[PDB]
Amino acid sequence: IVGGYTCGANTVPYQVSLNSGYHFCGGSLINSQWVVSAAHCYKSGIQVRLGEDNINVVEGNEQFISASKSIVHPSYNSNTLNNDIMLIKLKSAASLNSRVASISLPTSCASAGTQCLISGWGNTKSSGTSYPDVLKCLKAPILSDSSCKSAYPGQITSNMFCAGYLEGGKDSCQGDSGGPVVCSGKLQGIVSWGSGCAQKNKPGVYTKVCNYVSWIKQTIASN
Ligand SMILES: NCCc1c[nH]c2ccc(Cl)cc12
Ligand SMILES: [Ca+2]
């Protein structure tokens, strides 16, 4: 996250870190046994880390649970990042508490102008590199589909939305991939892609979770 703030330990209790020996992506806990992330985060040998603040120090609220199964959306296109969504099933159910909690799926798509919270352990610099150890937060609005299409001509599908600031300076970034965009207490987005980070007229692009609720629920019911 570029231009964000330190969330505070366990203030984003649905945030997960996907670990393959190191943090490589975020995700969101959607019930005691399932995580949603970006399909571009797919790899084998995922450990889900819940209750994290400092990903390099055991602080006491962590749950580390191996993935038993990953399900990439059947229509994920790695070239266009259309349908950039994946489900991860945990080997055992998380213990839910004030610091480890699921985030509700939306019943409705959020409108442009809606304020959202984006969070992650990604790069904090738009140029060069500095990876924070503790979770970073950004409040950003959802942008109109027209401003999103103008920023990324020919690249925005109906499964994507833009959020952030056209002036630049505040954005999700490398390592934030897969993480949550929460709006009005619902999961609305997944950190998916952009042209760099925090660049003028290049807002972040997010997977539009409200389009996937049917697929998520039916997949969870059967797996
Ligand atoms: N808002 C940008 C979000 C994003 C997701 N994965 C990335 C990889 C590299 C860079 Cl530079 C940026 C990103
Ligand atoms: Ca920790």
Q: What total number of domains does the chain contain?
A: 2
Cβ of 172 closer than 6 Å to ligand 1, yes or no, is yes
206 in the same domain as 144: yes
For the question of residue 32 being annotated catalytic, the response is: no
| HEC letters along the chain | CECCEECCCCCCCCEEEEECCCEEEEEEEEECCEEEECHHHCCCCCEEEECCCCCCCCCCCCEEEEEEEEEECCCCECCCCECCCEEEEECCCCCCCCCCCCCECCCCCCCCCCEEEEEECCCCCCCCCCCCCCCEEEEEEECCHHHHHHHCCCCCCCCEEEECCCCCCCECCCCCCCCEEEECCEEEEEEEECCCCCECCECEEEEEHHHHHHHHHHHHHHC
Q: Is the domain of 92 the same as that of 154?
A: no
* 70, 35 Cβ separation under 8 angstroms: no
State in Å, rounded, how far the first CA of the chain is from the last one.
33
**Which residues, in sequence order, are CB contacts of 104 under 8 Å at separation 6+?**
185, 186, 187
- For ligand 1, is residue 129 a contact (CB within 6 Å)? no
Q: How far is the CA of 194 from the centre of ligand 2 (A)?
A: 28
Is 54 annotated among the ligand-binding residues? Answer: yes
* Structure's resolution in angstroms: 1.6
Same domain, 185 and 197: yes
CA distances from 202 to 111, 151, 205 (A): 19, 6, 9
If asked whether residues 98 and 136 sit together in one domain, one would say no
Pair 142, 180 in one domain: yes
Q: What is the CATH number of the domain that holds 162?
A: 2.40.10.10
Determine the longest span between alpha carbons in the chain, in angstroms. Answer: 46
218 assigned ligand-binding residue: no
Domain co-membership, 133 together with 217: no
My answer on whether 35 and 97 are in the same domain is yes
| Bridge partners (DSSP) listed for residue 163 | 142, 204
Report the separation in Å between the CA atom of 84 and the middle of ligand 2, taken as the mean of its atom positions: 27
Is 40 catalytic? The answer is yes
Q: What is the dihedral of CA 197, 157, 189, 202, to 10 degrees?
A: 20
User: Does any ligand 1 atom lie closer than 6 A to the CB of residue 123?
Assistant: no
- The coordinates were experimentally obtained by X-ray
Same-domain check for residues 20 and 66: yes
If asked whether residues 77 and 166 sit together in one domain, one would say no
Residue 180 and residue 91 share a domain: no
Contact 24, 42 (CB under 8 A): no
- Looking at the structure, tell me whether residues 56 and 147 fall in a common domain: no
Q: How far is it, in rounded angstroms, from Cα 103 to Cα 28? A: 7
Decide whether any atom of ligand 1 lies within 6 Å of the 199 Cβ: no
Domain span at residue 166? Answer: 5-7+103-211
- Considering the domain architecture, whether residues 118 and 183 belong to the same structural domain is answered as yes
Q: Would you state the structure tokens that stand for residue 112, as one six-digit string? A: 């442009």
